[model samples]
Target chain A: PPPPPPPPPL
Target chain B: SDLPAGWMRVQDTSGTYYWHIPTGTTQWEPPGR
Candidate 1:
């Protein structure tokens, strides 16, 4: 969707 | 489910944020669901 952004925590 | 995961957060607990996330984290304190 959004380029599968990095981990919400990472 | 092994497909969805449950119980002690029965899922992939590897490098997670508590058995719910991965291995780096594996804590068991309800809210567990």
Candidate 2:
């Protein structure tokens, strides 16, 4: 599985 | 004093400002823009 996506920017 | 309801303004040890959301999330920018 692919890595989790990065958290959204503020 | 115009921050969103339940959203608080806080500062870190380095004096950087942050916004604490009621949803348990924190962001570096102000919300409700």
Candidate 3:
């Protein structure tokens, strides 16, 4: 659940 | 609760569903379950 925040902080 | 969408919300496919995506049953070939 902590995969580097999605682009644009999805 | 299935969000009052009725029935269950297994795949999040709520049942107020005016449409449905068939869960590839345990083997209509194999369940997408």
Candidate 4:
């Protein structure tokens, strides 16, 4: 799987 | 002066009440009582 979902906001 | 009221101590009273005129400071007493 991918590492993780990156946060949409900074 | 020797031991007395400080210059930082100021009391002002007018047609309504006595108020300590400082910024956001509640140093007030009642009036007309």
lDDT of 2 at B13: 50
Residue range B1-33, candidate 4, lDDT tens digits: 221232123333332223223332333344222
DockQ measured for candidate 3: 0.03
Candidate achieving the largest TM-score: 2
Every model: iRMSD = 8.5, 6.2, 14.9, 22.9
Model 3, B1-33: lDDT tens digits are 323232222322231211123432111112223
For model 2, how does the per-residue alpha-carbon lDDT over B1-33 read when each residue is reduced to its tens digit? 567676666666554444444465666667763
Candidate 2 Cα errors over 4 Å, as ranges: A1-10, B19-21
The alpha-carbon lDDT assigned to residue B14 of candidate 1 equals: 46
The TM-score between candidate 1 and the true structure equals 0.21
Candidate 1 residues lying further than 4 Å off, grouped into runs, are A1-10, B1-8, B11-18
**TM-score of every prediction relative to native:** 0.21, 0.48, 0.14, 0.15
**lDDT of candidates 1 onward, in order:** 0.35, 0.55, 0.23, 0.28
Off by over 4 Å in 3: A1-10, B12-33
Scoring each candidate complex against the real one, what DockQ results?
A: 0.08, 0.07, 0.03, 0.01
Stretches of candidate 4 above 4 Å error?
Answer: A1-10, B1-15, B23-33
Interface RMSD, model 3, angstroms = 14.9
